[PDB]
Amino acid sequence: TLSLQLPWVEKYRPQVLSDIVGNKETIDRLQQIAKDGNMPHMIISGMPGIGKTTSVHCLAHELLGRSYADGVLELNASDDRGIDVVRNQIKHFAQKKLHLPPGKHKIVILDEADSMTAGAQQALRRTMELYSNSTRFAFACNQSNKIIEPLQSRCAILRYSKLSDEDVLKRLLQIIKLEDVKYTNDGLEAIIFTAEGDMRQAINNLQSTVAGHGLVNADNVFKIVDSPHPLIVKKMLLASNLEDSIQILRTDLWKKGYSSIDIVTTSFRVTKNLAQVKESVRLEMIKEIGLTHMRILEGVGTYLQLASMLAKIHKLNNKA
Amino acid sequence: ASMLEAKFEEASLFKRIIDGFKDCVQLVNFQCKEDGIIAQAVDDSRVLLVSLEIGVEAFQEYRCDHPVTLGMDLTSLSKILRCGNNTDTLTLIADNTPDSIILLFEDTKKDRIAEYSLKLMDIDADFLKIEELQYDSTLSLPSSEFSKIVRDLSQLSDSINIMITKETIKFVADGDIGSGSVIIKPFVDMEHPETSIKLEMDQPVDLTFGAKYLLDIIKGSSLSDRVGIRLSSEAPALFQFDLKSGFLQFFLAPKFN
Amino acid sequence: MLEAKFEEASLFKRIIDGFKDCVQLVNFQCKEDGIIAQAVDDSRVLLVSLEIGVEAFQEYRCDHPVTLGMDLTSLSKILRCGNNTDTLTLIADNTPDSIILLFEDTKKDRIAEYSLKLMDIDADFLKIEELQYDSTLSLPSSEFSKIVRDLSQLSDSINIMITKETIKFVADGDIGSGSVIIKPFVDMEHPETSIKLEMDQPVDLTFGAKYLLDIIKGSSLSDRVGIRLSSEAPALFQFDLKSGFLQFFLAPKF
Amino acid sequence: ASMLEAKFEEASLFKRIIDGFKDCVQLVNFQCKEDGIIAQAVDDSRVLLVSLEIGVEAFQEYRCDHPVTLGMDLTSLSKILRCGNNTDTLTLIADNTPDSIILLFEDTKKDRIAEYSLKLMDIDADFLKIEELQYDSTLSLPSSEFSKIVRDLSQLSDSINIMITKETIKFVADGDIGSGSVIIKPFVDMEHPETSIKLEMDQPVDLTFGAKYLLDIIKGSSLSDRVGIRLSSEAPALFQFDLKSGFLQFFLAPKFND
Amino acid sequence: REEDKLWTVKYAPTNLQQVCGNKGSVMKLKNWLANWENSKKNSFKHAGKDGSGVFRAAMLYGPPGIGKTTAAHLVAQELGYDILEQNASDVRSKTLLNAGVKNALDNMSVVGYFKHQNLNGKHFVIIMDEVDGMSGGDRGGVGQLAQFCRKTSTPLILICNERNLPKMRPFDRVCLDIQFRRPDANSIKSRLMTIAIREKFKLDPNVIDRLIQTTRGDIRQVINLLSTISTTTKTINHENINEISKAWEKNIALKPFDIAHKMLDGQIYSDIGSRNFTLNDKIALYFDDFDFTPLMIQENYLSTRPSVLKPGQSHLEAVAEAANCISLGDIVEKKIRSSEQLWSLLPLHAVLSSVYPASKVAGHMAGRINFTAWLGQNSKSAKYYRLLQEIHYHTR
DNA sequence: GCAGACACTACGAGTACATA
DNA sequence: TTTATGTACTCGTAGTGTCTGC
Numbered sequence A: 001t002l003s004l005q006l007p008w009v010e011k012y013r014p015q016v017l018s019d020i021v022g023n024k025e026t027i028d029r030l031q032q033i034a035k036d037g038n039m040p041h042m043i044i045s046g047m048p049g050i051g052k053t054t055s056v057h058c059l060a061h062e063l064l065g066r067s068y069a070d071g072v073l074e075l076n077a078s079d080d081r082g083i084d085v086v087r088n089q090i091k092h093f094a095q096k097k098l099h100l101p102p103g104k105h106k107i108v109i110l111d112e113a114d115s116m117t118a119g120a121q122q123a124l125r126r127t128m129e130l131y132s133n134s135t136r137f138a139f140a141c142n143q144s145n146k147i148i149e150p151l152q153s154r155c156a157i158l159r160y161s162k163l164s165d166e167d168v169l170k171r172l173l174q175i176i177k178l179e180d181v182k183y184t185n186d187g188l189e190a191i192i193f194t195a196e197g198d199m200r201q202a203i204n205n206l207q208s209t210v211a212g213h214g215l216v217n218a219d220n221v222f223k224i225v226d227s228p229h230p231l232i233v234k235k236m237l238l239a240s241n242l243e244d245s246i247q248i249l250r251t252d253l254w255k256k257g258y259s260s261i262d263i264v265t266t267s268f269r270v271t272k273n274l275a276q277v278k279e280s281v282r283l284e285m286i287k288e289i290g291l292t293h294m295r296i297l298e299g300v301g302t303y304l305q306l307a308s309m310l311a312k313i314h315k316l317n318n319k320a
Numbered sequence B: 001a002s003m004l005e006a007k008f009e010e011a012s013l014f015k016r017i018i019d020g021f022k023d024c025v026q027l028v029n030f031q032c033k034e035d036g037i038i039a040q041a042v043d044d045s046r047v048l049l050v051s052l053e054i055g056v057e058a059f060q061e062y063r064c065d066h067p068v069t070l071g072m073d074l075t076s077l078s079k080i081l082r083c084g085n086n087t088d089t090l091t092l093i094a095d096n097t098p099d100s101i102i103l104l105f106e107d108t109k110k111d112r113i114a115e116y117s118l119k120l121m122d123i124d125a126d127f128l129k130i131e132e133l134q135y136d137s138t139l140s141l142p143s144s145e146f147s148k149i150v151r152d153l154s155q156l157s158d159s160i161n162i163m164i165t166k167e168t169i170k171f172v173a174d175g176d177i178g179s180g181s182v183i184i185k186p187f188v189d190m191e192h193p194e195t196s197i198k199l200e201m202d203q204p205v206d207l208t209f210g211a212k213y214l215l216d217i218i219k220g221s222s223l224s225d226r227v228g229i230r231l232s233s234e235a236p237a238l239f240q241f242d243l244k245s246g247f248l249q250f251f252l253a254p255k256f257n
Numbered sequence C: 001m002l003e004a005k006f007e008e009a010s011l012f013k014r015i016i017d018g019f020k021d022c023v024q025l026v027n028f029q030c031k032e033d034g035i036i037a038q039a040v041d042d043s044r045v046l047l048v049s050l051e052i053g054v055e056a057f058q059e060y061r062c063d064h065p066v067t068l069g070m071d072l073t074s075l076s077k078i079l080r081c082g083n084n085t086d087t088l089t090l091i092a093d094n095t096p097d098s099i100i101l102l103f104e105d106t107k108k109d110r111i112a113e114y115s116l117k118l119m120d121i122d123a124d125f126l127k128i129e130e131l132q133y134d135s136t137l138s139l140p141s142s143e144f145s146k147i148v149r150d151l152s153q154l155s156d157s158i159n160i161m162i163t164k165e166t167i168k169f170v171a172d173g174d175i176g177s178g179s180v181i182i183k184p185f186v187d188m189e190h191p192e193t194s195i196k197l198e199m200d201q202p203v204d205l206t207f208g209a210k211y212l213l214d215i216i217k218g219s220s221l222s223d224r225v226g227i228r229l230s231s232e233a234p235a236l237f238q239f240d241l242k243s244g245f246l247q248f249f250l251a252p253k254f
Numbered sequence D: 001a002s003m004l005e006a007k008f009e010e011a012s013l014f015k016r017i018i019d020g021f022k023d024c025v026q027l028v029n030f031q032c033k034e035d036g037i038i039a040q041a042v043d044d045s046r047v048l049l050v051s052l053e054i055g056v057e058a059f060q061e062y063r064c065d066h067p068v069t070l071g072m073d074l075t076s077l078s079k080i081l082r083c084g085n086n087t088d089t090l091t092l093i094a095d096n097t098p099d100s101i102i103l104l105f106e107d108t109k110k111d112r113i114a115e116y117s118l119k120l121m122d123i124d125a126d127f128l129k130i131e132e133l134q135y136d137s138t139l140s141l142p143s144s145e146f147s148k149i150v151r152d153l154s155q156l157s158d159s160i161n162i163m164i165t166k167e168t169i170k171f172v173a174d175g176d177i178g179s180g181s182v183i184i185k186p187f188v189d190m191e192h193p194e195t196s197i198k199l200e201m202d203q204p205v206d207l208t209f210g211a212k213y214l215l216d217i218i219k220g221s222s223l224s225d226r227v228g229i230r231l232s233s234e235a236p237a238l239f240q241f242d243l244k245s246g247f248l249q250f251f252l253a254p255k256f257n258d
Numbered sequence E: 001r002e003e004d005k006l007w008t009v010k011y012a013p014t015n016l017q018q019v020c021g022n023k024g025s026v027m028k029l030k031n032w033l034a035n036w037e038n039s040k041k042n043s044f045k046h047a048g049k050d051g052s053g054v055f056r057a058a059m060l061y062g063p064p065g066i067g068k069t070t071a072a073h074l075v076a077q078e079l080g081y082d083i084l085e086q087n088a089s090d091v092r093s094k095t096l097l098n099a100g101v102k103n104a105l106d107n108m109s110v111v112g113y114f115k116h117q118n119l120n121g122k123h124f125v126i127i128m129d130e131v132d133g134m135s136g137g138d139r140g141g142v143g144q145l146a147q148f149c150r151k152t153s154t155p156l157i158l159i160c161n162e163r164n165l166p167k168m169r170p171f172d173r174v175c176l177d178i179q180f181r182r183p184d185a186n187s188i189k190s191r192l193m194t195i196a197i198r199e200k201f202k203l204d205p206n207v208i209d210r211l212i213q214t215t216r217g218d219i220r221q222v223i224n225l226l227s228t229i230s231t232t233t234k235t236i237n238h239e240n241i242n243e244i245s246k247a248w249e250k251n252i253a254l255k256p257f258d259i260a261h262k263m264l265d266g267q268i269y270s271d272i273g274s275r276n277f278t279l280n281d282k283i284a285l286y287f288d289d290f291d292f293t294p295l296m297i298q299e300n301y302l303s304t305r306p307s308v309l310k311p312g313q314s315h316l317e318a319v320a321e322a323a324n325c326i327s328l329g330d331i332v333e334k335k336i337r338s339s340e341q342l343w344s345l346l347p348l349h350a351v352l353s354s355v356y357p358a359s360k361v362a363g364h365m366a367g368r369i370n371f372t373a374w375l376g377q378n379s380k381s382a383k384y385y386r387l388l389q390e391i392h393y394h395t396r
Numbered sequence F: 001g002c003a004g005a006c007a008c009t010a011c012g013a014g015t016a017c018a019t020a
Numbered sequence G: 001t002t003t004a005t006g007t008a009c010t011c012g013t014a015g016t017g018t019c020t021g022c
Ligand SMILES: Nc1ncnc2c1ncn2[C@@H]1O[C@H](COP(=O)(O)OP(=O)(O)OP(O)(O)=S)[C@@H](O)[C@H]1O
Pocket: A008, A009, A010, A012, A013, A014, A019, A020, A021, A022, A047, A048, A049, A050, A051, A052, A053, A054, A055, A141, A142, A171, A199, A200, A203
């Protein structure tokens, strides 16, 4: 069995708060907390892959360089995050006597706290209210709606935002300077367009393209990763001249092996997030796509159901 | 070669002492001074005050450099204390400003050594200055007999109405299912004095106690053959178990009258 | 007007331990000749009847028959309080809404008196159907308990078949099958452990595993259990006591 | 005549072997040949392997004409084994192309022969032979002592680090609530040779193991009074429990270190 | 050791006049707790104008971060009582509550002996925080707490968030009903002026209104917000107030009345409203209370004066159009809650039951939002059914 | 040696959520 | 009093097995 090279996702994982590129105000605030020391309870939320847990880990490393292995607790959904284990472990950690530097506090990191049970969060509320001058919590969830209201009340909400293409380009050029590779600007633009703000997706696509071909060119990138289905579905829905939408479907979704359920769900999401057309036409289109979704889920999954959904959408578009 | 080298000569004694009040309280502060080890704990319901004191004579070699607070969880201490043998000699060790303590379980055979580190929990508990007062009655009976009687009565009601009148202890209990009563007579046993009942009468008493609290108190009945209970009308009961060089006295507050 | 002073509370303790789970509410229709009781489970398929004569009691005096509707969990707690060397004294009044269980020890060190109220439970219909049973066997209770437990591990329906002096407890399930046969062994040095059978006519009866496991809890009463079966009448598992006996009536379930 | 006829003296034996690895393994198979009833199975998590061999010496009378494979569910088999007494004698009976075995519980003290049948199963796991023969450290210590050590160190943490030095065996079990360090040195007890501990150190060994699987290993300490651990880097640990005719050797994969 | 604690604990109310806002609730609570002795000697029968005599226990409810816990603790400490605080971190099921503070309800403290003039130092006050955290329901401790309220010999104080849970029903009137509200801007303004003086950071007197209204009166998050802002930039003015507001909006899950009130507004469905309040926002608004929103839309989808009528379309035609989609979404709800349990149709149910029907009848309202009446009539219909099968069994 | 006393895994029953 | 399977969690429960000491 051959050995495996470390993936570029964590082979170039940042270790300093200056390495991560993104929301400049957020990173400056994190650096200020790093220099000062008095870290408040924070709830970091945002889209996947935009550098949430890496910032928390870098901040904890900078704050507890010498006592990271002793005064930092890391829990996630992979651990038994239930009321008994949360109670016992968090209360044992929050009362443990560890002589940190005067500005440094214990940090309890809870990755992906969105999937955490309500009673465990209720216990965490009381634990945070008791032990706050010795330990400081730190959540990192994709959506902050799952976390109960009192936990957000006693924390400091800090939301991330999707990275602009400039920051993804800067990081990609930094990694390309770190490891030698031949690239074309068209290939990098294609990778950035495919990533859609997801830095981890960009790194995975770049690594896959380099391993598959060795040259980061537009054709190689489009061979490794296909065009995203939301874009082709949006092109299908927005286009008039029903025959054109029918052939777009039959060419780019049916013969490319996309399941009918996936096409219908993607159409629902696209027409929900669509902004070019007015509200009433979006509502009708959602109604028709939902009727087709009901038909598909009942079991009648064929090309003709999708064609009929497109036909009803186009009859709506031409205003009968 | 550290601050504290308190060395028990027989570890199961310390295991019994810790298990004596394991369930009632979890966090306990251990004050370690030159005279001995004194510990005070407060129950979560603030009704039980488990005062403890171990003299220097109990330890085979007790050497405390200067007074210090040792706050440790009883759950972790009981988990660690299940790692030794009857011949094992506990050699509790603490360093300067301790964050962890080494419970070195030595053995008579020198090829078997087991050291366990225990992380100290920061506990904020105000010290209670108890005072010596005369109680209306002092009852001393064997711990096994007392435990038997109280476990008999606790299977009937959640409350016990201890009564001492006319040199007649009147352990009674009334509940929804029924009513129970036990009457004992103080006497002296020539064959085995530790099986006798001794009582002194100063004032009558009217005291009431719960069930689970008394069960937690008698959980530590293994340390002493006989328990010394002192009753006062307007003062907490003092359930005292005499050790070889110390005691484990419980302060349980009687209910409303 | 009831004074039933036992010589050892362990008898009453193992009796109630025998019928903890088969029934929860029981009406004690105590009489002069002793105490008899009849009880039916919630499923209306298991019938338990107990009988203890005066010969077991050190003292007994019941002038007026009184039907006592009494809880078994409270008795279990009160008799777990009791232990050896203590003589239980069942005491009742003329109109005993509350019962008294005096625990008298040899020494005056600690004598305990207890109480328990009497709930309203309707008097069960005293069916006295005693139809003759085709086959009769009696084997040690430990052997029967082991056999029924091991065969109930495999399946939930134990078949009992008697033919040619060879009882064949067969239970067939999903993990496999189980067949045990018993020859009519006779023992001289230890007559208590023996297998004797009176096969008048062969029978083939199937019973559920839950009730067959439940009836085992009376094994502490007797070292031997007598079982008599009929093709249509309910089976009779009888536990011998010093004075009387305790019996289980379970109808066949084909 | 049944082609497979294996007789057990002191039928509590086979129950002890079955209980040795009932908890860790749920599905086994028994390649019964003329040499003896061997077995080999891998857990669902593909971490711990259980090899087994029972020689012809352990059987009163053993006769196996052709190689037989008996894929089995260990839970049902252990339940069947529990359906008997140690006084009784157990017999495995299987015919040609078996669908199930026949287990007999006979005793001359009282004629109460009980015949149980357990359905077979098609595991279809060909596995492979053991290809590990060289080990750095080869140590044997009493089973009771090792089981006790594992038991009181599994409560502290989930990882038990076994370290081997020059005539020094160290178990480190650092965890959340504290740490642990059991140091045991070789010594030869002349009075009780069964309580002696032996060490044979070639190259230093530093391996960590999971607590739950090590508890599953020590669950077999009732099978034999002594266990011989044979550690080596880049090689699974070999916990071998000797039998009267064969052995019950386990293979445990050390956890990764990074 | 100072300058490491949170700003929400070092700047905490020490005495009763430092609790900014809700003065009436605090003084009512203190009056109730100060007159429980004579009420106890009155056998909870005679009460004054306020009714504190007949209320054996008092419970506290309101939005977070307004001072329920702090005011309760200060009142308990000031009057010499010994605090006994409980929480959801300690399990409070039937067993652990019957073997918990059940004994302490009719028992007096032991620490009050050695801490002593104080006349109530040998008593307990039961401060049960996080009682909404106990989601046990049946046999979950709520019935045990009802029994405790029925029979306790010590003051009992409960702290929760809001009362509209069906779990919270058994405390309808057995407990006192003191309620806290959002504190006024003047008291918070004075408190934050003191905070700004203490922490030497610039705080304009006019940005504070926006800081409060973004956080919805949650004082603790306000103090945390000023702390984290002043970490890197201690001066705030009109320049950064919009960025601070958009970055630290509270984003409360809306109340079942509030989802309907926001969804029936005609402003959000206009061309400007659609851009500011997108369709995804409406879907999230439905999914805030996806259980009660489809009904709550339906009971009052016709009691609104329309403002989004198409030219030539009457109000009754719009109501019929909305009713057609309510009927259509009924089928989707049935298919979701069926044997198959196709729960991927919930976003469909959003549009088919709340978005589209409210998109035709939007505008200003004829009256206040009417609660779902389908629940009560469904209960009455079920009782009528049970009666009919009962008389059908009896008549045969 | 036997009966308890413990901690232990295991089973049963009930609440809660289910798309971003 | 509603949805109506499957999943996950939480609890108290009853057996089950192991260690102490009469
Ligand atoms: N601002 C950034 N600068 C540099 N690398 C980044 C940045 N954001 C993300 N990355 C890269 O993304 C990877 C780390 O992503 P994560 O932070 O683990 O994703 P995440 O934020 O945790 O989102 P989820 O919810 O866990 S999927 C590493 O390969 C990083 O190099």
